[PDB]
Amino acid sequence: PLPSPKAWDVVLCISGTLVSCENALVVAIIVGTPAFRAPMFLLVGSLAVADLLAGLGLVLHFAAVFCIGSAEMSLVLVGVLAMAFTASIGSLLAITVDRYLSLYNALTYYSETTVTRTYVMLALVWGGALGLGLLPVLAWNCLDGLTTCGVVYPLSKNHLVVLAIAFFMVFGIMLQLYAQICRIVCRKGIATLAVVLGAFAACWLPFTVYCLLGDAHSPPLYTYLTLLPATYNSMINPIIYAFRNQDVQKVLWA
Amino acid sequence: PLPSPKAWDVVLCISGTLVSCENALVVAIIVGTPAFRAPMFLLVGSLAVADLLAGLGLVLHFAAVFCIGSAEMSLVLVGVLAMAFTASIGSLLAITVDRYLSLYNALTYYSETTVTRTYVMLALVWGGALGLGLLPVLAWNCLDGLTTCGVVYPLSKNHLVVLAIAFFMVFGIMLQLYAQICRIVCRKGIATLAVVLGAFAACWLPFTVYCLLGDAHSPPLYTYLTLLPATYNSMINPIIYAFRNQDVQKVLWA
C-alpha cells in the first residue's frame, strides 16, 4: 500500500518540474554556444546546474516515494536535494563576491585576475555541497531511530542546525557584500539590488529559521509551507541572474 | 547561605571581578584624559563600558542569587548580562567596520568627517543591546511556565535561538570584513589579525552553538563550561583593543 499523494506533495512536484524546465533552458543556452566561456558565466552555469539538480531531485523524489516505492532510494534523493540547495546558495555567494570584486577593480584601475579564483570558488562551493550532502547517506541520519530526528524525516536535527548555522554565516557575508556595493557606487540600481537581496532572503529565512524553531513532532504542514519559498527562489534565480543578460536575450531572439 | 554555591560559580564570580577591574581601569584611562575624543576611542570606550557592565553584572548576580536571595533581582541582573554581552558584540563589530573604513580611506584618497557615522553605530549597538536585553523583563520570560525554557533558566529557548542567529549574522559580516582587510592591506602582520579573530571565534562559538544543540534537561555543567570562554573573551578584549594603543599605554606608564 504505497501512500496516496497529498495536495502539497503535488505542489512541490509541479514546482520541481517548472524549476527543472527553466534551468534546463538556461543551461542549454549557456553550453550550446562556445561564446560563454568567461569566468563570469561559469558561476551562472553552476547556479543553473544546481537549481536543475534540485528540481529534478524533487520530481524524482516524488515519483520514487509515491509511485515506485523504495526505502534506500528516497534517502539518497533527499541527500541530493540537500546538496543541490547547498550548491545553489554557494553559487549565489560566489556570484556576489565576484560582482563586488569587479566593480571594485573597475573603480580602482587595477587589472583583475579572475581566471583561477573562479575555479577555486567553484571547487569550494561544490566540495561544500558534496560534504554537506553526503551526511544523510551514511553519517548523519535518524533512520537508526536513536538520533533525535529533525523536522525533515531523512535528515537529523543536528545536521539541519549545522546547515542553518552555515546559511546564516553566508547571509552575514552577503549582507556585508551588498552593503559595500551600496557604498562604492555611492540610484535605481541600488533599489534593484536591495529588491534582489530581499527576494533571496524572504525565501530562505522561513525554512532556515523553522529549522531552529521547529520540533520533530511539529505538524507536517509547516515543513511544506517553509520549503515552498525555497523552490520559488530556485525558480526565480534564473530570471534574475540568467535572462537579465543581453547576450542570453539575444540568443533567445535567435 | 541557603543555596550553598558550588565550585563552578566562585570561578564565574572571580572572572567577573577580574573583567570588571580591567575594564574599569580602561574606562578610567579613557575618560580621565580629555584628549581621547576621537571616534575610535569612543568605540573602545563603549566596548570597555559593555565589558565592565558584564563583569559587574556577574558579580552582582552571584551575590544576589547565592548570598541575598531574590528572584526578581536575579532576573533583572541576568537581563543586564544579556544586554552587556550584546553590546560587547556590537562594539566589536563597530570597531572592526571603523578600522576597515579607516584603511579604505587611507589607501584611497577620499576623506570625510566620521563624527556622525560613529554616533549612529553606537546608537544602533546600544539600542540593540537594550532591544535584545529587554525580553527577559518582558513577555518573553520563561519563569512563568509554558515557555520551553532554554539552556539558561530565566531565558527562553526562542530568545536564545534569536541571539544565536544574530551572532552568526555578525560573524559572517566580520568574516567578510577580516577577508577584505586581508586583501586591501596585501606580510607577517596579517597573522595577528587571524589570532585576534580566533580570540573571538574560539571564545563565542561554543555557547552560541550549544544554544542550538542544547536542551532544557541537559546537564548544568555544560552551561558553565561553555560560558566561561565568553567571560574570557571580555577579559582579553581590553588587552587587544585598549592596552595595545600608543596614547593609552603612554598614559598608563605615567
Ligand SMILES: CC(C)Oc1cc(Cl)ccc1CNc1cc(-c2ccccc2)nc2ncnn12
Ligand atoms: C552594526 C551595523 C551598523 O553594521 C552593519 C549592519 C548591516 Cl545590516 C550591514 C553591514 C554592517 C557593517 N558594514 C558597514 C556598515 C556601514 C555603516 C554605514 C552607515 C551607518 C552605519 C554603518 N558602512 C560600511 N562600509 C563598508 N562596510 N560597512
Ligand SMILES: CC(C)Oc1cc(Cl)ccc1CNc1cc(-c2ccccc2)nc2ncnn12
Ligand atoms: C565561498 C567563499 C570562497 O567565500 C568566502 C569565504 C570566507 Cl571564509 C570569507 C569570505 C568569503 C567571500 N569574500 C571574499 C572571498 C575572496 C576569495 C579569494 C580567493 C579565493 C576565494 C575567495 N575574495 C574576496 N575579496 C573581497 N571579498 N572576498
Ligand SMILES: CCCCCCCC/C=C\CCCCCCCC(=O)NCCO
Ligand atoms: C561554501 C559552502 C556554502 C554552504 C551554504 C549552506 C546553506 C544551506 C542553507 C539551507 C540548506 C537547505 C537544506 C535543504 C533540505 C532538503 C529538504 C528536503 O529534502 N525536501 C524534500 C522535498 O521533496
Ligand SMILES: CCCCCCCC/C=C\CCCCCCCC(=O)NCCO
Ligand atoms: C546591531 C546589534 C548586534 C547584536 C549582536 C548580538 C550578538 C549576541 C551574541 C551572543 C549573545 C550572548 C547571550 C548571553 C546570555 C547570558 C547568559 C547568562 O545570563 N549567564 C548568567 C551567568 O551568571
Ligand SMILES: CCCCCCCCCCCCO
Ligand atoms: C559550525 C559548526 C562546527 C562544529 C560542529 C557542530 C556539530 C556538533 C556535534 C555535536 C556532537 C555531540 O552529539
Ligand SMILES: CCCCCCCCCCCCO
Ligand atoms: C521574513 C522572516 C520571517 C521568518 C519567520 C520564521 C517563523 C518561525 C516559526 C516556524 C514554525 C515552527 O516553529
Ligand SMILES: CCCCCCCCCCCCO
Ligand atoms: C531572525 C529573527 C526572525 C524572527 C524569529 C522569531 C519570531 C518569534 C516567533 C516565535 C513563534 C513561536 O511559536
Ligand SMILES: CCCCCCCCCCCCO
Ligand atoms: C571552534 C569550534 C568549537 C565548536 C564546539 C561546539 C560544541 C557544542 C556542543 C554542545 C552540545 C550540547 O548538547
Ligand SMILES: CCC/C=C\CCCO
Ligand atoms: C583554501 C582556499 C584558499 C587557497 C588559495 C587559493 C586561492 C588563491 O587566491
Ligand SMILES: CCC/C=C\CCCO
Ligand atoms: C544599516 C544599513 C547600512 C547599509 C549601508 C548604507 C551606507 C550608505 O552610505
Ligand SMILES: CCC/C=C\CCCO
Ligand atoms: C537605519 C539606520 C541608519 C539610518 C541613517 C543612515 C546612516 C548614517 O549615514
Ligand SMILES: CCC/C=C\CCCO
Ligand atoms: C579562502 C579564505 C580566505 C579569504 C581571504 C582571501 C585572501 C586573498 O589573498
